[PDB]
Symmetry: D2
Subunit: 405 residues, 4 copies
C-alpha cells in the first residue's frame, strides 16, 4: 500500500536495490513498471522505453528462472515454413527471425523436398558434455590420474558418482587430455529431454569430488575448462560431437530443381563444392562447410525456447550435393550436424509462448516412456530444416538470385 | 454474414468472413503466404494463417499461447519475416551502469538464461568501482567473399595480379562505390585455388551492418571486372570467403565488421568484495581455461568464457542478426596482475569481428529501437556516419568484458553450479 | 659402363631398372648418373653429389628408387639429456646453425635442475579410410553396427589376423552424409606401423563388406588418419605416441645458463606460445620450435621426416615454482609423435648407429614397443630442452645476435 | 701444439680440467680430428661403445659446416637421393632430386611426372613472395597499443619503419605490415622480399632495426620477443594459409583420358571422386587447416633435404589444396591443380652453402643468386616444388582410387 513514487524514493536511498523489486512488490508487472521508471531517469532519452512492451505477459515463469532486472520483453516475429516432409511425417516449423527472405527461402526448400518424396534423418549420437580443468602437482601425477580414469575400475567409480545426481544423467564416456600438470576431463552423458548443461555440471561436480578422494592433491581449477566446449568454436565438438549428432538427406528430382529452385542440378553441385567445401577451406573454417545453417538453427532456437548463444556450436554442418538418378540429373543432398545442443524441457522451454512452438512440432516437454525422444525428434527437425534452407540458398546463389528481396 | 457462401460469389473486390477466405484459399490454391495481399489488415491475415495452420497440427490448440494481437506487422511484412503466425516474447533485462569511456550505459539483454543478466550486472559493478573501462575501435569494414572462376589457374592468377595493381583496384573501387554514398571499398584480399579466385571485398557501410549494401556493390564490381575478363565465370556472390555466419579463421585474423578492444583494472578490494575471489585465482583460471583449455579443444577465436552469451542477448534486444553470433562472439580475454602490490586485476577483451548496425533489418522495428535508444545509438548518425554502430560495438565489447569478469570470478570461487 | 648406355638409349629399358641388369649396385647408380648428366643444362652438376662406398643393397628395394647417390647431413650431439634417471646423448642431423648448440644448452639447464621426467600417455598408429553407402541411412547403420560389441569383435578379429602386433584398440567413426570415415587405431610393436595398420585396415574393410555388400571402399586413406597433413583430430585424439615431459629449472640456473629470469621466460611463453599462436590461428602449434628438434632427430634416426607435420604438435607451458616462486617449471605435451625403431629408414646402418647411441635400435623382444616408446620420450624431452633455450634467447633478446 | 699430443692425451686433458667438448675445434688443428676426438669422448658415455662404427665422418668438408650449419659434430647422415622426371613444367624439363628413405615415393612421383609429360606439360605461377617475422610487443594499456596500430597504418608511419627495416640489407625490402591486437599486446607481421635467400635471418635483422625505430616513437613500448609466433614459423597456423608466407604458388595440368587409364591405372571419374571425398571432405572431417591434399609433405620434405632447405619448415611449406575436375571435349580428361600459399624456400645461405646440396640445386638450374633478377632462382625452385607435389598427388591419388596403395 504505497505509491510508485514512494517506492522509488525508498529505492533511490540505497534500501531496496533495483533487482530486488519483485521480492517486495506485490504484482510482478508492477515491479517491472517501477524498474522501468527508475531506468527512465538514467537515460539520455527518458521516453526510450515507451515502445518496449511489458504489460500483460506472464512474468511468474520468468522471475527467479529465466531473466533478472526485467524491464519488459522483446517481440520477435515468428513465421512458419512447411510442411517439412521428414521421416514419413509432416512438420510445420516455427521460425523466429527479423531477417527477410529466411522464412520464404526455407519454405521453398521444404517445397522442393516435399515434391521429391521427402527427407530421411538419423540420430548418430546423443550426449551433452562438460570439460573441467583439473590440476595435479606434476605431469607425472596428472598422467597417473588419466591412466586411472582410463581403467574400467576407475570409470566405474566415477560413473556411479556422476549418475547418482540424476535419474536421467547417464555417463557414457570420458575423453581426457593432458597439458603438463593440467588435466582436462571431458564428461559425456545422456540427459533425458533436457539440453542438459545444468544436469551435466552437477554430475561433473560430484564425480570430481569423488576423484578427489582418490587423489587428494588434485586441485579442481574450474568446472568448465573450455574443453566441453560450450558456446565457443572448437574442433572437439566438430570431431567428437556434443549434444545430438544427426544426418539428413533427400533426393530432389531434376524437374523440381528446375521448377521450384529455378536452377540445375549441375549448377547446385558446382556451387556447393566450390563454396561450402573449397571456399570454407580457403577461409580456414572448422565445421562451417555449409551456406547458412546458423540462420535456420537460430530462428528455430529462438522460437522454441532453446539457448540461442549455442548457435555458435549447434550450427556446425557439412552440406554435400551430388548427381543421382538413372540419368544423373536429380539432386542428392545431405546435411551432417554433429553437435546440436537442444532440449524440450527446462530453461526457456518452460515459457508458454515457446511451449506453443514446441507443441506445434509435437515435441513439447519430457517424453515419458522414452526419455530423450522429444529432444532427439527436435534435433532431426532442425537438421531437416537446415537442409531445406541450404537447398534454397544454394539454388539462389547458383542462379544469381541472392539479389532478390 | 456467416454460413459459407459459394466460391464464385465470394470473389471479393471487411470483405467476407474468415470461413469464406479459408474456403477460397483451400478451393483455389492461394498459398497461405499471400494472405496480406487480399486482407484489409495485416493482423487478420495473420489470424487466418493461424486458423489454416491449426488444422494441420496434431494438437490443433498448440497456438493458443503463441501471441499475435496488437503488434505492428506493417513494419515486419516485406522486410523482416514471411508467413507470419505471431511473435515470440523474449524477456529483456538490464545490466548497468556500464562505465565505458567516461560514459554510462544501461545495457538491455534479451534472454531466457537465468543469472546471465545478474552476472553481467555484477561484472558491470566491479568495472564501475574500478574507475571504468576504456575501449577503441581498431577497424571497421563489412565483407563479402564471392567465388569466381577462370578457364585456367594461369588466368585466375592474371586476374589476381591485375586486381593488385593500383590501376585495376581504382576501376573496381569506382564501380563498387557507385552503388551508394556509403559504399567505400577499403581493400581487397584475394585467394587462389587453382582456377578459382576468392575475392574478399571490404567496405564501410555507414551505420548499417552492411550485408545487403556490400553484396550489391560486390555484384557491380564483378560486373565491371567481367568486362576486362569476359572468360570469368561468377560462380556465387558468396563463396564462403566473407565469411558470414560460419566459423572461419579469416574473420579472426583479418577482422570483419568492427574490431574492438576493451580494458579495465579491478582493484584488489573490488575483486574480493564484489567478485568473491582473488586476482591470482582469476588469472590462474583465465590462462588455464581461456588460453590452454581452448587450445586443447582446438579452438579458433574462442579464447573466452562466454562472449556469445552477452553478444546474443544484446543482439536480440537491439534488432541485430542473432545468427551472426557465430563470428561476432570471437574474443580473446586476457587477465594480468596490476598495481603497486600486483594485487589488482588488469583485464582486456579483444573482439575482431563484431558484425553490427543501427539502421536496417530488425532495427526498424519499434521495440528494438527502444533498446537501441536506451543506449543512445538508434538509427543513423547523420553528423558522423557509422558512429552509432561503432559505439554499439564498443558497448558490446565492454559488456562482454563485464560478463567475462563475473563468470570467471564464479568459476574461480566455485560458484558456477 | 660405356657400352651399357647404348642399350638403355633404345626402348624397352628405363633408367629405374638398371640394378636388375647390372652386377653391382654402385655401378648401377654410376650409369644412371651418366645417363642423367646428358639431360642436364649443366652436365657437371653431379660432381659434388657423393655416391661411392655406400651400402645400396639395403636401400634399393625398400627405401628409394632411381638412386643417383646420397645427401650427407651434418650430425651433431646434444646432451647429456637427463631424463627419467637416465642420461642420453641425442644425435641431431641438421644444416641449421645454432640448433644443436641451443638444444645442448637446454639440456644443460635441465641437468643442473635435477633432470626431466616423462610419461607415455597413449600409443597407437591410425589409418582413416573413407567408405560410402548408397544412403546416409545406410552409413548410419554401418556406424551403429561398428559400435556394437558384436560388430567391433568381428572387424577386430579380421584386423588382428594380419599380424601379431595388430591389436585393434578402437574405432572412431564420423559420418558425412552417405560417406563414412572410420579411424582404426592400433599398437604396432616397435615399428611406426603405417604399413601394418594399412594392411590390417584393408582386411577389416573387406570383412565389413561381407556384412554390407552395398558398401563402396573409396580409399584406404580418406585423410581421417590423419597422415602428414595438419589436422585437429591428431591433436585431440592423439596419433602414434602421446607424451608429456617436465622439469624444474633453479632460478640460479635460469640466470647463469639461460641468461634470463623465470619471470621473463613465463611472460614470453604465455604471450608467444599461448596468445601469439592463438592470434595466428594455430591448431596444435603452441610451442616455439618443437619442429626443429623433431626434424633433426628424425633425420638422424631414420624416421620419416615428412611426419614432422603432425609429430611436431606441442604445447609448451611455463610457471613459477619453488619456495620463493623464482624457479622455472616447464612442461611439453606432444600428443602425436609418429615414430619407430624398426622398418623403413631405420634399417640403414648409419641411422641404426644414431638409434644405438640412444639404446633404442631395433625391436625390444622382451617388451615389444618399448624402444619406440623410449625414443618418443627422448624426442619430447629434447623438444623441452630446445624450448627452454630458444625461449631464454627470445626473453633476453639474443636470437638474432646468436 | 695439439698435433704434438695424442688423442688419449687430449681426452685426458678434456676430462682433466673439464673442457666442454663443443670447443674441440678451438684446441685441435684439423677439423676432422676434432670430430674424431668428440666421437671417442662420446663413445665412453654410451651403453654400447661402438654404436658409432657405422656413422660416417671421414672425407667430408667440415669447414663449410663448422660455424654455419651444425655444432658438436660427430659425423654426417647419408640420405639416399633419387630422381623423378622429366617434369615438364612451363615449357621446360626438370630432373627432380629427392632425398628420402620412404620406398615408392620416388617411383610414384616419377609416375606422376610421366602422366604430366604425356599430357603436354604443366603450367605454374608465383602469386606472391614475402618471408615474414611476427614479433610481439607490449604497451602499458590497450589504448596505447591501439595507437601504435593506427600509427603503423598511416603512410608516414609505414614509411619510417620501412626505411629502418630496409636499411638492413640491399635485398631486404619491406612490402607490408599486418597487425593484431590482444589487449595491450600488439603482434606485428613484417613481410618482405629477400632476394634468393629463404630470408629468416635477413627478415629478423630488419625487424629488430624496425622495432628499435618504433621504440623511438613509443618509448613506453616493451619488445617482448622478436618472434611472437605471429610469423608463423615452423608451427601450423591459419595466418600462413590465408595470408601466405614465402612463396604462394599454383600449378595445373590436364591429363588425357588415355593417359589416366594407361599410366595411372585408373579413371578420370574415379580420381575426381577420391579427391573430393578424401582431400576435401576427409580433411574437413579431420579438422584440417591447410591440409587439403594427399601427401604434399612427402615431396616437399624430399626436395628440401636434397636441396639444402630447412626441412623443419615442411610444417607450413606443405600447406596445399589439391583440386581435380573433368575436362576436355568429352569431359573425360583430368584437370588437376595444386595451390601452395606458403612455400618457405631459398637457394642461397644455410645448407644451400654445402657442395652436395649445391649439386642438387644445379641439377634444377637454380643454385645461388640470380644476378639479373634477385629472387628468381628461389621462385623457380618454388614452382618446381609445387609442380612436383602435383606430380606426386596424381600418382598417389591414382593408386588410392585403384586399390593399389599397400601393393
Ligand atoms: C524469395 C525466394 C523464395 C523466391 O522464390 P522463387 O523460387 O523465386 O519463386 P516463387 O515465388 O514462385 O516460389 C517458389 C517457392 O518459394 C516459396 N515462397 C516464395 N515466396 C514466399 C513467401 N513470400 N513466403 C513464403 N514462402 C514463399 C514457396 O513455398 C514456393 O512456391 P509455392 O509453394 O507457392 O509452389 C528466393 O528468391 C530465395 O529463396 N532467395 C534466397 C533467400 C536466402 O536464402 N537468403 C539468405 C537467408 S535470408
Ligand atoms: C548470481 C551472481 C551474480 C551473484 O553473485 P554474488 O557476488 O554472490 O551476489 P551479491 O548479492 O554479493 O551482489 C554482488 C553484485 O552482483 C550483482 N547482482 C546480484 N544478484 C543480482 C540480481 N538478481 N540481478 C541483478 N544483478 C545482481 C550486483 O550488480 C552486485 O550487487 P550490488 O547490488 O550490492 O552492487 C553470481 O553468482 C554469478 O555471476 N554467477 C555466474 C553466472 C554466470 O556467469 N554463468 C553463466 C551465464 S548465466
Ligand atoms: C648459441 C647459444 C647456445 C649460446 O648460449 P650462451 O648462454 O649465450 O653461451 P655460453 O658460452 O654461456 O654457454 C651456455 C650453455 O650453452 C651451451 N652451448 C654454447 N655454445 C655451444 C656450442 N657452440 N655448441 C654446443 N653447445 C653450446 C652449453 O651447453 C652451455 O655451456 P656449458 O655446457 O659449457 O656449461 C644461445 O645463444 C642460443 O641457444 N641461442 C638460441 C638459438 C635458437 O634457439 N635459435 C633457433 C634454432 S637455431
Ligand atoms: C609403385 C608404382 C609407382 C607402380 O606404378 P604402375 O603404373 O602400376 O607400374 P608401371 O610398371 O606400369 O609404370 C608406370 C609409371 O610408373 C613409374 N615407375 C614405376 N616403377 C618405377 C620405379 N621402380 N622407379 C621409378 N619410376 C617407376 C614410371 O615412370 C612409369 O612407367 P614408364 O616411365 O617406364 O613408362 C605405383 O603403384 C604407385 O605410385 N603407388 C603409390 C605410391 C605412393 O604414392 N605412396 C605414398 C608415397 S610413398
Ligand atoms: C547468404 C548468407 O550470407 C546468409 C544471409 O544472408 O543471411 C550466407 C552465405 O555466405 O552464403
Ligand atoms: C559457463 C558456460 O557454459 C556458459 C553458460 O553457462 O551459459 C561457458 C563456459 O564457461 O564454458
Ligand atoms: C626461432 C624460430 O623462427 C625457429 C628457427 O629460427 O629455426 C621459431 C620461432 O620462435 O618463431
Ligand atoms: C599415403 C599417405 O599416408 C602418405 C604416405 O604413406 O607416405 C598419405 C595419405 O593419407 O593419403
Amino acid at each position: 500500500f504505497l505509491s510508485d513514487a514512494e517506492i522509488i524514493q525508498l529505492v533511490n536511498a540505497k534500501h531496496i536495490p533495483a533487482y530486488k523489486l519483485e521480492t517486495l512488490i506485490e504484482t510482478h508487472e508492477r515491479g517491472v513498471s517501477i524498474r522501468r521508471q527508475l531506468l527512465s531517469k538514467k537515460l539520455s532519452e527518458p521516453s526510450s522505453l515507451q515502445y518496449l512492451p511489458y504489460r500483460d505477459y506472464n512474468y511468474s515463469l520468468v522471475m527467479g528462472a529465466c531473466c533478472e532486472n526485467v524491464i519488459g520483453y522483446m517481440p520477435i516475429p515468428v513465421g512458419v515454413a512447411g510442411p517439412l516432409c521428414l521421416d514419413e511425417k509432416e512438420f510445420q516449423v516455427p521460425m523466429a527471425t527479423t531477417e527477410g527472405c529466411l522464412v520464404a527461402s526455407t519454405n521453398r526448400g521444404c517445397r522442393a523436398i516435399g515434391l521429391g518424396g521427402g527427407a530421411s534423418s538419423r540420430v548418430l549420437a546423443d550426449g551433452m558434455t562438460r570439460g573441467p580443468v583439473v590440476r595435479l602437482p606434476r605431469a607425472c601425477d596428472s598422467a597417473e590420474v588419466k591412466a586411472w580414469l582410463e581403467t574400467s575400475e576407475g570409470f566405474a567409480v566415477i560413473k556411479e558418482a556422476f549418475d547418482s545426481t540424476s535419474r536421467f544423467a547417464r555417463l557414457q564416456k570420458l575423453h581426457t587430455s593432458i597439458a603438463g600438470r593440467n588435466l582436462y576431463i571431458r564428461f559425456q552423458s545422456r540427459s533425458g529431454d533436457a539440453m542438459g548443461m545444468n544436469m551435466i555440471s552437477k554430475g561433473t561436480e560430484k564425480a570430481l569430488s569423488k576423484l578427489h578422494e582418490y587423489f587428494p592433491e588434485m586441485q579442481i581449477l574450474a568446472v568448465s575448462g573450455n574443453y566441453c566446449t560450450d558456446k565457443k568454436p572448437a574442433a572437439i565438438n566438430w570431431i567428437e560431437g556434443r549434444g545430438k549428432s544427426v544426418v539428413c538427406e533427400a533426393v530432389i528430382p531434376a524437374k523440381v530443381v528446375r521448377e521450384v529452385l529455378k536452377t540445375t542440378t549441375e549448377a547446385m553441385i558446382e556451387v556447393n563444392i566450390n563454396k561450402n567445401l573449397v571456399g570454407s577451406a580457403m577461409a580456414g573454417s572448422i565445421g562451417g562447410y555449409n551456406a547458412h545453417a546458423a540462420n535456420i538453427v537460430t530462428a528455430i532456437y529462438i522460437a522454441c525456447g532453446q539457448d540461442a548463444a549455442q548457435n555458435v556450436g549447434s550450427s556446425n554442418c557439412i552440406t554435400l550435393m551430388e548427381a543421382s538418378g538413372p540419368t544423373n540429373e536429380d539432386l542428392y543432398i545431405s546435411c551432417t550436424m554433429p553437435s546440436i545442443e537442444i532440449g524440450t524441457v527446462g530453461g526457456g522451454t518452460n515459457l508458454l509462448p515457446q511451449q506453443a512452438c514446441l507443441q506445434m512440432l509435437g515435441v513439447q516437454g519430457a517424453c515419458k516412456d522414452n526419455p530423450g525422444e522429444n529432444a532427439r525428434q527436435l534435433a532431426r527437425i532442425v537438421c531437416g530444416t537446415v537442409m531445406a534452407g541450404e537447398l534454397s540458398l544454394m539454388a539462389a546463389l547458383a542462379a544469381g538470385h541472392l539479389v532478390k528481396s
